[PDB]
Amino acid sequence: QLYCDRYLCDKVVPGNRVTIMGIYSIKKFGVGVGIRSSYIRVLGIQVDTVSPQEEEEFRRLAALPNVYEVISKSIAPSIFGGTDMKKAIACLLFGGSRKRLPDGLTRRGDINLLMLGDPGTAKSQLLKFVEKCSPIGVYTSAAGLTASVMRDPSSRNFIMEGGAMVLADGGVVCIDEFDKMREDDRVAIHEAMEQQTISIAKAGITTTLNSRCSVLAAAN
Amino acid sequence: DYALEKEKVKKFLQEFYQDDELGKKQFKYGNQLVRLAHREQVALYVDLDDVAEDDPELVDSICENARRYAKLFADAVQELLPQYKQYPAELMRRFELYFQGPSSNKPRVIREVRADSVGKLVTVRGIVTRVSEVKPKMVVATYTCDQCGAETYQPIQSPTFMPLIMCPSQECQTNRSGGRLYLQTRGSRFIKFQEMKMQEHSDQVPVGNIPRSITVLVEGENTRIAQPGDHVSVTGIFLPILRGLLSETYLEAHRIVKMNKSEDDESGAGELTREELRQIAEEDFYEKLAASIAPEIYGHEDVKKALLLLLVGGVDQSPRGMKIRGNINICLMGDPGVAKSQLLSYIDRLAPRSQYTTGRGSSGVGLTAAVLRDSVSGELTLEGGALVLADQGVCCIDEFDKMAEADRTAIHEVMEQQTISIAKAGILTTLNARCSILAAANPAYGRYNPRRSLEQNIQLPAALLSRFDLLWLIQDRPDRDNDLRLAQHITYVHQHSRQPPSQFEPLDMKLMRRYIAMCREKQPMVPESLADYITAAYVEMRREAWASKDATYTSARTLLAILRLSTALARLRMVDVVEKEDVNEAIRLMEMSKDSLL
């Protein structure tokens, strides 16, 4: 357990790699008779990992005559055959544009894809690739995909669990075995791709979560 | 200051006139003080409209404080009592004083009473819940020093109190510097006490908000007035609880009035006048009421004739120790849109004790009685269902074909023996549930069809079909003429918001609810000379339903219909013996209930 201070607060996010320099010490708020608690008072922190000239290697590449295939060729090195199934995936990484008519009746800005066919493990590779090479992306087979309402042991009441499609903001979500997902969960993912938001009205929960992600599904 | 108020209240208590006593100007409180002095009465409901008749200022400063004043009054009467006819002046009180709300104030709701009215006289309306049982609350604890042979007292105010171990008499201490004194439950004084919660009417709540509760400390004479699950109106101070700066509050009831009838409990005021005996003595009194039941509904001249027998009910015997029920059960199988859920909603409001339930929104343990645990004590307690809360009244269950099949056999017990026998793992008992049931249902798949016979476009097991004395069967026959008159009725209704002028104007609900309560307690008999007529009729039935291809399951439980469906009629005509003219009315009913199929 750590203890950050004035300017070290809000410097790291759950999921980071760090390197702490702290003063290993003991709590003094005064199993065993003389046992104490212990923490590390942090007083140094680190994190482990755009340009004008970099802009030009995007410019010229967008301008070169055969700009289309150069990407769709280098987005699936291992798996080969039928570049259409790789042609399409090139678009999902960019997507259309979000329009707001005068009525505020916004429009989608993402796409969805289904790769039907036998599970022959040729598609899991592709899922892993598209997840790895994405600005935001999650590959799922826990809490679920959409939100749930679960009876908390402590509260003894129902609480709300936003799943994956609420954490992926603009990103891309990959799914396999489209008949394995929980019946309720499959209903909710249907509605989420329909409306692009999840709104549960149950025991003590009436909230809304904007789902803004891209579905790349693989069937069987 | 108050020393001059104790005189301005004595004046009012000794001087007040009243004319409505039916005599001359007597003294409303003049007689009361004598009765109280002769220990023939305990409570003195000092009205506040009468102080607001000659001094509208004192009323302003009562409902402003109402805590000092309720003590000045109990001192004024304490002084006046001897003048008509132990050590502390409270152990010898033996009476209490209560304020009956002033008429100018308006009955608030539970949500409205805020902190700006702590310590003032308020008035709330609500539904009772979780009324406790009477327990003795101490007022003046009496101790004794067994050593020095004395008697001592101390008065209690808080919900707690610390006893005494002194014997503070300086003589006992001075002589010997030693001695303890025992508590004692003889010389002390207790007073009845019970606490009960109130909730808002779920009607007068914002569209989806949670109702709030309040606590009421009934004590003294107002106890045992209110029953749980009840509409009530309470008048009492609104105080905080003793023992940081936040405070929890309770209502300290001074007056409790039942408002079941939507106006004020007038069941005890069910007095029929001679000018109404005029009507009740007419030739066809039975036929006026029948037409004055839910007049907004055209047609159905016969169904309204049976829904009245259900409200009056037959007589119940007990020969050689073999109980026979004296209630009537009725079902209303029929096509969609024939105003069944209107008839039921009306028969709900025309009954002293009634309940409304829907088949698809009620579970089988929630109808009869449920055993539920308290996570505060871990103790299992019983909790009545619908049929228990509707003990001496009527229960209404529409959408009766859609109730789950394991939640419907929990009615077979209440329809014949009229008890509920629970043997779950906390309790083992039989509650009394003497209710008469009235249910509505759709025949097969929404609509009757003439291909399949009965019993297959009804879908009730014979064991339950036979529990119903009258399974009435209506239809949506689209006869061009029958539709024209129905429409010319409903459009008149939507124009004027009333029914078209009928032969006889319907009686008020308030008046029928009394005409019937007077008509229940007759208990007519049966004459022997009729046992040959009745018999033959019954026999004939067992022939037809045995020599037919549609008829239902008739059994020896049908005879008791004819019998108990005629002691109802003979109870309307105010006779004290069943006559051969009512047996034929009953027999006609049991025939006009399945003719809608021929």
């Binding site: - | 050689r320 073999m322 026998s421 043997a423 049966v526 026999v539 399951y553 008791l560």
Partner: protein, 329 residues
């Protein structure tokens, strides 16, 4: 609790009982005094009267056999309106230490024994159901058909061995009781259609029909004479033998009687079982297993107790054989 109190009978009363027990029909004179509101139904009252005495309480601890049930289980099947539930409602109000149960409002563990988290000590403790609270008396189970086959297969133990073996989380024990079921059911389709076979209107298995020993089929149609007599009787209840004879005759006949078989009675009990097999085999009505041969004993002895005969003779087998035969017809 009043077995010591039976010695507290006026000797003026034992004369009365012993003398009433000599009239040639004291059987039909006591039986016909049960429930003086049902119509004739002459046999069902005979069965329900023999159930209030029960066979002897023999002591089989020596033969290592175990124990031996001495009470009689009775089943009533028949089409609606035939006054079954009234007989249960009457018995339940007569016998002390009894219960009344129903079909859907009773579970598997609520009838025999459940395990509850005791609130204070937070520990699992055992409790007793309905078939164990009766324990000396009758456990009326109405609506016998409408209990899913799970909760119906529980009666197999408590109604034949008079025991109950529990093995749950921390409780491993073996109760016992001396109850006697009295059940009432409806035929399947709730209508006794005579096209099907008797073992098809009941629709109960054989491993459950054999634990009963008096299956009364109330086959009653629209007999124009019966209906007329019944209606004439029922209407009479609207105008307007003793008990303490029966209430004391029963205590006596329990306290100081123990019918032991004979050799002339035992020689009519062997053939009465060798014919039952050939009869019940073909018809397809209800087969007969050796358990019935014990029931006859149970019935025969129970008849001898009615007349205080203290010894089972021939006629006490012919009666309780005609009763066992003329109930399924």
């Amino acid at each position: 609790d009043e077995e010591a109190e039976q010695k507290l009978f006026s000797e003026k009363r034992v004369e009365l009982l012993k003398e009433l027990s000599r009239k040639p029909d004291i059987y039909e004179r006591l039986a016909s005094a049960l429930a003086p509101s049902i119509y004739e139904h002459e046999d069902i009252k005979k069965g329900i009267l023999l159930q209030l005495f029960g066979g002897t309480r023999k002591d089989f601890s020596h033969t290592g056999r175990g124990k031996f049930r001495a009470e009689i289980n009775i089943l009533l099947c028949g089409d609606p309106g035939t006054s079954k539930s009234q007989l249960l409602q009457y018995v339940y109000n007569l016998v002390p230490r009894g219960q009344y149960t129903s079909g859907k409002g009773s579970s598997a563990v609520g009838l025999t024994a459940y395990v509850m988290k005791d609130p204070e000590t937070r520990q699992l403790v055992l409790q007793t159901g309905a078939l164990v609270l009766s324990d000396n008396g009758i456990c009326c189970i109405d609506e016998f058909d409408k209990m899913n086959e799970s909760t119906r297969s529980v009666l197999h133990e408590v109604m034949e061995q008079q025991t109950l073996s529990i093995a749950k989380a921390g409780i491993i024990c073996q109760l016992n009781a001396r109850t006697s079921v009295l059940a009432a059911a409806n035929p399947i389709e709730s209508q006794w259609n005579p096209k099907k076979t008797t073992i098809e209107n009941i629709q109960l298995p054989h491993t459950l029909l054999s634990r009963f020993d008096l299956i009364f089929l109330l086959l009653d149609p629209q007999d124009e004479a019966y209906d007329r007599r019944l209606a004439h009787h029922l209407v009479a209840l609207y105008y307007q033998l003793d008990m303490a004879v029966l209430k004391d005759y029963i205590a006596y006949a329990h306290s100081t009687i123990m019918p032991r078989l004979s050799e002339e009675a035992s020689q009519a009990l062997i053939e009465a079982y060798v014919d039952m097999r050939k009869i019940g085999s073909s018809r397809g009505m209800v087969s007969a297993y050796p358990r019935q041969l014990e029931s006859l004993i149970r019935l025969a002895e129970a008849h001898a107790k009615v007349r205080l005969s203290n010894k089972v003779e021939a006629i006490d087998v012919e009666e309780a054989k005609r009763l066992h035969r003329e109930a399924l017809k």
